[PDB]
Amino acid sequence: RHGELQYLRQVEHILRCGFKKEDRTGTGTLSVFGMQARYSLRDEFPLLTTKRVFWKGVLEELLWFIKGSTNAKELSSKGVRIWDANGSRDFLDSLGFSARQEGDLGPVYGFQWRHFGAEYKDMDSDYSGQGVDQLQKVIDTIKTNPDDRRIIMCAWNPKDLPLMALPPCHALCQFYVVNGELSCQLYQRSGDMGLGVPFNIASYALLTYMIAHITGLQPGDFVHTLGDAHIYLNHIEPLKIQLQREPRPFPKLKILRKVETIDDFKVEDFQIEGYNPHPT
Amino acid sequence: HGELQYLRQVEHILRCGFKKEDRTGTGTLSVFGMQARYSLRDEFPLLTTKRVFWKGVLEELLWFIKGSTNAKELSSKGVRIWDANGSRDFLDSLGFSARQEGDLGPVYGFQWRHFGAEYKDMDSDYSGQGVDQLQKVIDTIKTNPDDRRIIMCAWNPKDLPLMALPPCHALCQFYVVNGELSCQLYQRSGDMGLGVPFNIASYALLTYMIAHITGLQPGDFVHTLGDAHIYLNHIEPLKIQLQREPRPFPKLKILRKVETIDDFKVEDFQIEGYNPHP
Numbered sequence A: 001r002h003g004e005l006q007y008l009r010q011v012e013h014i015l016r017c018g019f020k021k022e023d024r025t026g027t028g029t030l031s032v033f034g035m036q037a038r039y040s041l042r043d044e045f046p047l048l049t050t051k052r053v054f055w056k057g058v059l060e061e062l063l064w065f066i067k068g069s070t071n072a073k074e075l076s077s078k079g080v081r082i083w084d085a086n087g088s089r090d091f092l093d094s095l096g097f098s099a100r101q102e103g104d105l106g107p108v109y110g111f112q113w114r115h116f117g118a119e120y121k122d123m124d125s126d127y128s129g130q131g132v133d134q135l136q137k138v139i140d141t142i143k144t145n146p147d148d149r150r151i152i153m154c155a156w157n158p159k160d161l162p163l164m165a166l167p168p169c170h171a172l173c174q175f176y177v178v179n180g181e182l183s184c185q186l187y188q189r190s191g192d193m194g195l196g197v198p199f200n201i202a203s204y205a206l207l208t209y210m211i212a213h214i215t216g217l218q219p220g221d222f223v224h225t226l227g228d229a230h231i232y233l234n235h236i237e238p239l240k241i242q243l244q245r246e247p248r249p250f251p252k253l254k255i256l257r258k259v260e261t262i263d264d265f266k267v268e269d270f271q272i273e274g275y276n277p278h279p280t
Numbered sequence B: 001h002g003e004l005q006y007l008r009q010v011e012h013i014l015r016c017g018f019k020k021e022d023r024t025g026t027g028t029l030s031v032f033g034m035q036a037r038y039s040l041r042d043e044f045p046l047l048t049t050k051r052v053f054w055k056g057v058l059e060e061l062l063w064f065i066k067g068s069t070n071a072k073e074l075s076s077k078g079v080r081i082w083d084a085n086g087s088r089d090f091l092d093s094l095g096f097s098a099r100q101e102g103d104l105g106p107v108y109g110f111q112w113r114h115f116g117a118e119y120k121d122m123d124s125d126y127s128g129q130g131v132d133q134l135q136k137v138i139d140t141i142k143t144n145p146d147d148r149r150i151i152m153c154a155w156n157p158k159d160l161p162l163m164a165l166p167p168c169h170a171l172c173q174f175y176v177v178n179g180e181l182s183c184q185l186y187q188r189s190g191d192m193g194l195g196v197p198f199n200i201a202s203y204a205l206l207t208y209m210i211a212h213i214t215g216l217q218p219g220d221f222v223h224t225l226g227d228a229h230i231y232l233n234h235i236e237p238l239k240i241q242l243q244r245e246p247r248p249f250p251k252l253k254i255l256r257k258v259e260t261i262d263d264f265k266v267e268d269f270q271i272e273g274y275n276p277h278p
């Protein structure tokens, strides 16, 4: 009943029953369409243990989303370089974004979360007060109407898709409250089980911890829903080895001071305790 | 039998759901996060343990497809499910007193065909405005079946204040493998007793239509729920329905070759072998 066994069973399922299917580069995957897992957030934190997850990247990326940044260099300057290739001069040129400064990802996550529907110009523009601040709306609704069934933050913006260096893999999420507990469901249109999915689970579990903290609630569940769940073909043999490792008890996530607004969270406010992932 | 997934979801909520009130303070039993997979392969998942309103399923979907946001254009087909949301007493509730009766605001039909366009009223001409997500999905399926971004999203944060009701069916995603077209719906709120069987039929039908248009075979319909709930007044009726054994699903037949999604008509469809319980 360790929560990571769900993830292992999803990987096993794709290895056994997935179909060969290729991505935009013509590279092969094994793929299943439509999966779901539930990770409890109650006195533990689902940071996967059968292979180490880049927690520093999880935390800094989420803080970067929250402040609305679309500059890959603003994340890279924290030592987190996962978005840098998508803002490179050559990649941006290949998409027709010649006039963009290097690092300008377009209206990706942070912009849609804080300024949905505003007109994007570039990554250095001031978007204060423009568009729908979905993130603060979710927090507001949780505080005042926890029964609400419309508590959604949606990064999928069909109008803005052509401007993005990458359309969001995490298309939308929904929050839910019962019994003083805050839950979150992510709709992820595409998930690389080997590398991306563990990171994305941590990301939305952390966001739920953050929002629960500032709304006075306790973390409940993170429900992970996938569209195209896939394993790259050259990852099959390492994953078969990983699948025979027993999960170690999940770590705990501690928030080290009372924080009042989502914008006030800082990297030093968080401590992962007892994280003991299997080595690679 | 694929209907057993639905029955076990109902059973789970009656067993493990928590009491949770809705907008009207009326009580439900609720579970957050559920998923079921309904095969579309040589059968159609129109539930059999209780009759589903198939004519309403089909006419509502045709109404979405032509982009209408006028409940009176659907009611004129004898399908009244949207009429209350467009009534003058309900629009006034939401501060929409200057709005014509029947004007639902920028709901499914507008978002599917004109996402991002500026809504005015249900009588406006939106030709060529906004993103036609429906046609874009069909195009991408035809040209890039491997695409992992084949999404139609009715959830529009900018337009929510203008809507008579924000979409329960927030988005759906299509997927192609082995010549088969699948569809996954993200439904943020599901009334298991009254709404969900209708909703399953709707998106299974959309998948049959797009598969027909694109030369593919229907695959799976994957139903994902947020707040899956049962109104307390429905508990004993569902408890009886849970005792009913499902009959084999009917088949859906498309009676002619249709070239575009806009060309489908009610007469093109025939449900074969539908034998539901009362």
Ligand SMILES: O=C1OC(c2ccc(O)cc2)(c2ccc(O)cc2)c2ccccc21
Pocket (backbone or CB within 6 Å): A054, A057, A061, A082, A083, A169, A192, A195, A196, A197, A199, A200
């Ligand atoms: O470069 C990285 O992108 C990943 C990532 C995903 C979502 C996100 O929001 C941020 C990053 C990713 C992993 C696998 C993929 O197939 C594509 C991307 C990732 C996870 C962990 C470590 C590095 C990376």
